[PDB]
Design a protein around this ligand. Structure first.
Ligand SMILES: CNC(=O)Nc1ccccc1F
Ligand SMILES: CNC(=O)Nc1ccccc1F
Lengths: 348, 348, 348, 348, 348
């Protein structure tokens, strides 16, 4: 017997939906769910989704509370739907997927991923849940994560980090590095070799390699010398040119991180969703240099150096395809006389 | 085990709350309750109250569906709250009372009227429900209806009509005429002699006496002649004077019914609620005669005639008090040279 | 080049979406679309659906304005979606189907019904639109209407009436009687023999047979005599029994039409949607007789007589199944000593 | 002459309601109050309450702007209502009490606490306001605060801290330590001996005893030695065990404070109201250790040490009742071989 | 062809409105605009204005993204409207002006500032845009900014700082110091000599003169000695008196900044708009000293010292008019025996 009042009972007593039995009285007004405590209304949930408030509330309450892949990964792998859980998109305060399977009666298209409506959809499977590996094997389309080996299935090692209740972390008391597997049209698919973005914040940025410690700590010319980067235009691409009204380059998070220690800036996240490459409308507070569409990626600097050094530098412009978070990221590479002018995530 | 979804199940399957087990999926968007029937949303309920939508939905579902006293009677008797039912106020599309007893967890102030919070409240008790005559005996404050005698109480015989799911009617297959009993601070009251308003509609007005039949058939002058009404200002009070910009008189529903057969008019119900006297801002379409605050009452014409013939006509202006629907209705009586000038429910 | 403002232009200038170029200024406040005409705002559209206001506005604008099958027929045939039109459900003030094909960018699951997401969906195809009979041939699942023969398909002749901009009618200047054809998993179905409900209103009820004329004119006893209906419980089933608190019988629209000429009653439509059988919570004003869940169907009286005379009357109670509007309507038949006691659409 | 526009006049000119006379024009849209400044709308108030926006606005404007007891205290003492002021709950952005006395015409149940409706309610009285001590003496139920001595009334010394416009502080230019007194059913009640929670934030945590300076500054084993805490499981209870997927212990705010210097964590406040014991759904960012329902209290460490040391350690499990903020807080005490396994606020 | 979907296309692809062609599907619900990315809704804009959501969205998208005068300046100069751009008020999340010219069809009063409706309005002109200087010359009323010299027009040097996408900054890669000119009734007006407020935050405060470095760094008595301020009551006016329940003085931002390093405090911005003098309801966290209406201005300390030293100190009270941000700010000057008691922005 699922119900609004039972969902709120679990939220109040168990911090989330926990299969417990019971009911608390609830009031819904506009987009907010409340419950009486000591005779007054206490807010339990503000619906920021495009779903009816009582539906969003239940989905939220039923969010997966184990570490799960970050939404950008699931998106990059073409996931449409999850088997019998909810991947909550903490960046959008909303379900990451439109529909559900076996979760909620207003949004379910199916009780079980074996139902024929699920066969064209890429269904997300969690091998930490009993039976879900088997259900991947039987599904026409899907993405499977496991903590270990699945007999016969060639694994792809995913990122180190996963999301636990909206916190992106590398697990220590829990495991966040998964094997990933994918199936299209009944056929297991080979996951490409790939880099992974690092998912760091600008407020909390911590380097993760001696090279990155050097970038944060050394002056620009020292660092460029020490890692033999002459002619690669990190002055522009990574350090950022703030001298003109249009802010130049500045496409690596670590570069933003360096600048942020010195002076603040505004990042307007005008498409606020999780993705491998982010676009910001950036305004530098110190200089007033700015740019409407500044693509930023958080690659380990080591990885970005390896990508740019591996490039042929003998054409004016070309599109360079790099596989990142399993998706194929296009960059624009502009050169002159065998040195880099600029290299940036291509704006689409 | 009360729940939004169970209430909706009862509505969908039983036309109203009926204590049945079950659940349907529900969605709430702003003030409307919908349910999914075969993949599309069907409107179950639009909240017109000042309560949270899911709360109003449940009180509406749990409305009393037996003939019950009209809200105007309950209010005139000082009823605060009903015992274990909801008197639905179809004139306000809202619960007639703030709080409930033993009905709904969000609005209940008690489960049983015997709890101490109910003692100072005038509680409504329905003798047709097992045990409620008893509970009225224990109750410090209350109003009781019954269909027949109660041993040791003198009854007050109420109106002929009652409200069945919002239709006011004189029951032929069900009883609508109740015995009334009232208790203030543990003492059974002697209810006053009272007239009753008749609760008719302007559109479907039906005479209930030979005098009313004659009023509808005859011409003004004939009717006034037959019933010896010269000098009582019915021309003004009951027929209505449409010759000036201020619509004159027209304070008796039968007079509005008579005019509405010939030519129509606008009645603006600017305090929409059930009350013994109604105030309308009335605009006569044929003539443009209008009045901002036109008090209207539906008295049996014979009872109105009795009231007006029972007054002293020798002072220019005074307040005349008349018990109606158990409440004291003040009238203004204006006279000149021993005849009536006007007589109207006071606009105080 | 679809846009809010272009849709509004079409509404304002063409009464509906018509593919015209142009733009008017629009403003959206909560669920209402307005447009500026000479400096003030005029209401174009109030959203009563569960879709976003601008989305519902566009689907409403793009409604099919040719006579189309009533929604109850489409649902009974299992239609999921329409090919390149919107069947507007005037009973719910909402789109009849969740999704669209080739109509609206927010709701389209495809541009053409031939895309693979449509193959498992039962698609509605209108033979009056060039190419759609063809598309029905390629379609794995579908329902097709036409005005005339289709070479190589046996037709099923549908109802006389269809819905034109929300008015159900039997077309005299346009055709409303369609041939129906259905395909499940690539196989043309043989549609069952079926009766059709007549889709009449209680207010403007018009007899469509000499028996129905007689039913309206004659007294109960005469009519029952003329048509040899003794022992079939029409007194209860069709005339309705208003003598007890439970309103008895009254399951056939013509019986409600007959009563409504004499005295009025409340029909509460608590699941407002188009369906072959309707459930009303009905309160008779003259008598106070009432019933929470009164199933009503509008069958030609002759067809109802044929159904009831085609049953075995020898068991106390059983389920009688009758194809109507192409769907299986269960009835309860109650008999005693070889005569009918009652017979009603099952309240399951 | 109270009015929306007068309330807004005071807000604009006096920062809050100040009995001043005057009016500014106001516009209300959805849940927000605005006023024109220099021809544009400036937001004055966003209603986060379940009250009508214009009502919440007035209550907010009339909030008590003297230091007042924190809402958890008033709750723990059973306060239902305040005499002639509003205790604004800054943590819920809402009135702490449902109704008022002498404040606001939509929410008043009474103009004065002597009215008989107030007698069953525990009314909050402020002896800094003239007459309110006397009104406590006459009230059947109440809680009284004073700055000094009340002849005959045995005092209870309240917490050091009070809330001033939502800032919890120990007063220096103002007095925040009150005498508390309580009355149930006409009878002064003896307030229990009690500890008080410290009301500290995790961002702003300052130790308040040499012991607490030691906890923050020393390593875990040093501190446990220096205060002879071997066998008392502060390793678990206070320091927190982050080694397993379920975060172990961690029920004292100061322990959260220590960890927060090292690494951040997420505290989901899923019942956001003021209370003596808080429940969080906690996710540790460094380790990914987490717990759905982690009870946290902010006792001075000295006080928590005194509580746990005073316990008999010779049973496996028992419920230990401790009086905190005047309410009786249950703890679970789990022991083995005369040492503490775990000791935590009992989850209800 | 302007449209909701075209505006959203520009927002998504260009970070703001950029004249580009194209459309994305959009959904509007309540006050929020969304668009599909990867099958789910992503929030593009939350309407905090009193305009219809789709109108506010377009105005926002069309905001001027060059450095522009801070709204307080435009207000102080009497600007009603901007020529062919939108000055977005980032402090109110709303257009700074009610109407537009040549921007948006719901809010435009004119396509061009030469239209006769614009002649009484003070129109804001931007000489960085071609033709706009000329349009100032022809306008009956206006305010013009330029980066350089305009032949014949006597300039006023504006503030050093301007606002770029809501960041107030002194330009280095861009120019933020403008010449200002004003016209009333066809006649160029002489802008007064004036100080300028510094527009600093309390979190980010940086001194801007050796004097201000001294104020932040030195003790109170040192600083007062070093700059010969004895008898000028900076102890009160600038340092702030926290000893009594009413917080004394404290009207210079730098004084708040000093205190904030030591201890925090609450500033309730109860009229949140940009202005030259701000009013806060201030609560000091350390002492609980507070004040409902504390006027604060951010003058360079040098400038404030120069203002107060220039005053005659020989009257008890007088109104002192100082021109700041071009508007005439009244101060109250209270003296005794030729020393300053208090000096503060006059409360109106
Ligand atoms: C306090 N007295 C009282 O209630 N009396 C009574 C009530 C109901 C029926 C008959 C009775 F006598
Ligand atoms: C799969 N078969 C099929 O569709 N057949 C057919 C369809 C429409 C008209 C005539 C036909 F023969």
């Amino acid at each position: 017997a699922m119900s609004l009042e039972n969902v709120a009972f679990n939220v109040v007593n168990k911090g989330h939906f926990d299969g417990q039995q019971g009911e608390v009285p609830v009031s819904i007004i506009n987009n907010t769910v409340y419950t009486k405590v000591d005779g007054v209304d206490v807010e339990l949930f503000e619906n920021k989704t495009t779903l009816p408030v009582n539906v969003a509330f239940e989905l939220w309450a039923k969010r997966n509370i184990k570490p799960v892949p970050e939404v950008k990964i699931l998106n990059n792998l073409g996931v449409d739907i999850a088997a019998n859980t909810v991947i909550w998109d903490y960046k959008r305060d909303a379900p990451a997927h439109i529909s559900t399977i076996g979760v909620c009666s207003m949004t379910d298209i199916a009780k079980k991923p074996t139902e024929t409506i699920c066969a064209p959809l890429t269904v997300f499977f969690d091998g930490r849940v009993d039976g879900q590996v088997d259900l991947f094997r039987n599904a026409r389309n899907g993405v499977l994560i496991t903590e270990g080996s699945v007999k016969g299935l060639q694994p792809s090692v995913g990122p180190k980090q996963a999301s636990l209740n909206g916190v992106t972390l590398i697990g220590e008391a829990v495991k966040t590095q998964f094997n990933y597997y994918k199936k299209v049209d009944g056929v297991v698919q080979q996951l490409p070799e790939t880099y992974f973005t690092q998912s760091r914040n600008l407020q909390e940025f911590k380097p993760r390699s001696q090279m990155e410690i050097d970038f944060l700590e050394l002056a620009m010319d020292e660092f460029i010398e020490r890692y033999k980067l002459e002619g690669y235009a990190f002055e522009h691409i990574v350090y950022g040119d703030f001298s003109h009204s249009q802010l130049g380059g500045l496409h690596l998070l670590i570069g933003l991180a360096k600048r942020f220690k010195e002076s603040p800036f505004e990042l307007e996240d005008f498409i606020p969703m999780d993705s491998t490459v982010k676009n910001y409308f950036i305004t530098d507070a110190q200089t007033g240099s700015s740019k409407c569409v500044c693509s930023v990626i958080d690659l380990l600097l080591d990885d970005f150096v390896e990508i740019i050094k591996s490039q042929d530098l003998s054409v004016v412009s070309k599109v360079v395809k790099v596989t990142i978070d399993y998706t194929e990221i296009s960059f624009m590479l502009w050169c002159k006389d065998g040195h880099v002018e600029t290299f940036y995530p291509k704006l689409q």
